[PDB]
Subunit: 338 residues, 2 copies
């Protein structure tokens, strides 16, 4: 009734699937915060969907924009009370940030990584770039090592915005590392680091039918793909094809910020049915991305009905781990952050 | 060579899939702890398979039993040195226990749940029973709440030796609760608790397997099924059948203690291909199970090379959350299990 009217207005603004739950996640988020970034964060719906919901609400008189905040009109408060939609709570563990692992034991690694990455290459708009916080990076090392995927393993880093490979060198855990990125700024920076650190067993390389040096040679890959079905499949699929065989691990990040749960379902059928891998871990908001400098240039910025820069790291991704088994094999509308 | 000889000897003892990684996980675990239960824990391989690997290792001189501990021999030290297998590290967050959620805000609920559950029915061997820690229970409530799946929601609890339906009553969050279990001791206990708490909107059912009263009527379900593909398919799929439509949630535990990753792959194909649901969260060791009193009568005890009672809660399951989408549909003991 109330809800129907909203849903059809949202459908006129986006072809991203829209459910009553979409609207409800947004309304729950709005009750807990007026900040558009944190609304996207807390609703766990993709930015362009959130915008189309908040916009529909504002057109149909349930939300107001006021003080650069998204707030419920009196009509919106009748809506949430009528549907029993409470303010979204969050009980994320304040020690691990919900990562499940503590990094107390990697404190000097953290310090070093922080120091060495002070002059890191600034994220480039045309490589869809952004890097995770050094804390995330070190949490990544602690996570991988706790699943037995680092020590004396051969590790392939497919894309390295985050400079995970520099953290891996400083940990001293891998037998060897291979890293690949399109951006020559990164690969030069990594090589300079390796050469000065004296890490010998690292190959750097600056997308199609894998070379000899990659194919079936690694124990573990990490990647953080662009957020499309095709790119997730390409990148994760190529990661899997680097793996020696059964018993090998893959790590990658998938967001709720740019991918809807309908997308997730297609991604999960690729992993399970095209690659025949098993998903061993899916950890909410494991990856915290540092806010990037080219935002005013992005579609997300043009979509926002309130132009305000984010005041915290609103953009996070879930950590996926996969493992290979017998038979495993390797190889949009919801997007806005380019 | 060493590895091949160990794998072939393990294959003579189990029909569970065996990989080099299997042997590696066990050897890595053994270097962190000699306690058999902790080895099963740390290795994240199914208990009967860890027993087979440890026996095969023993038979061939790579491990010994000393002071009730599994330890590497000199020959075993040379094997791990050769394959570069270090001791398994564990960095589980010490404050949340790796649950991702903290429960400081539910300390009232916790004491209340502990007090109400002091005299709960003892886990019956004939059913598959073990209950999670009170802390697990409340962390479940915090997780479900933080995902927007409790407050003013209709919640179906399918099986409840954990007494989640009781913690849910004390939380006051749901609009209503339905619970089903075979064990009439449990449903009696939950009725009484509903009566004393004076929670009025709970429906309790006591029977085995398959109503109007469940089908397409709930927002959220929770269940903790027996660990076979068929049981997971039936329990989780029934759970999905209680859901209204898209946008609804279910929660359930799956163990690495009693299911191999090969089994995990079949389960995940069920969830994605037969039910068409999406997996939103898979959280390692979220659920901590209270050691159960009938242990000496189980298959696990009988298989153990050393018959020592566990000194800690070694048995844990991953939390899975799923969500329904357009087109999702529901449903209309085995080789790797051993808690019997
Ligand atoms: Fe924590």
């Amino acid at each position: 009734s109330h809800m129907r009217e909203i849903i059809e207005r949202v459908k006129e603004k986006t072809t991203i699937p829209v459910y009553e739950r979409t609207i409800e996640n947004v309304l729950s988020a709005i009750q807990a915060s007026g900040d558009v970034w944190r609304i996207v964060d807390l609703s766990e719906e993709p930015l362009p969907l959130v915008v189309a919901v908040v916009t529909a609400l504002y057109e149909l008189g349930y939300v107001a924009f006021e003080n650069n905040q998204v707030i419920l009109t009196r009509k919106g408060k009748e809506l949430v009370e009528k549907y029993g939609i409470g303010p979204r709570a969050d009980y994320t563990c304040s020690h691990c940030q919900g990562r499940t692992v503590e990094i107390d034991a990697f404190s000097e690694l953290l310090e070093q990584f922080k120091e060495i990455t002070r002059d890191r290459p600034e994220p480039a708009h045309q490589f869809d770039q952004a890097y995770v916080t050094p804390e995330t990076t070190v949490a990544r090392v602690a996570l991988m090592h706790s699943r037995g995927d680092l020590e004396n393993k051969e590790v392939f880093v497919l894309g390295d915005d985050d400079l995970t490979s520099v953290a891996l060198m400083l940990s001293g855990l891998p037998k060897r590392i291979a890293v690949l990125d399109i951006d020559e700024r990164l690969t030069k920076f990594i090589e300079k680091a390796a050469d000065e650190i004296g890490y010998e067993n690292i190959e750097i390389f600056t997308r199609k039918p894998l070379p000899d040096y990659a194919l079936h040679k690694f124990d573990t890959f990490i990647t953080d793909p662009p957020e499309t079905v095709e790119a997730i499949r390409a990148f994760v699929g190529r990661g899997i094809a680097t793996l020696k065989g059964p018993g090998c691990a893959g790590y990658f990040g998938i967001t709720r910020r740019e991918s809807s749960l309908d997308k997730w379902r297609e991604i999960q059928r690729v992993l399970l049915n095209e690659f025949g891998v098993v998903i061993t871990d899916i950890i909410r908001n494991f990856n915290e991305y540092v806010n990037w400098g080219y935002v005013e240039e992005t579609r997300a910025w043009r979509l926002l009905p309130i132009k305000v820069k984010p005041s915290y790291n609103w953009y996070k991704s879930y950590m996926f781990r996969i493992q290979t088994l017998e038979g495993s094999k390797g190889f949009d509308e919801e997007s806005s952050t380019t």
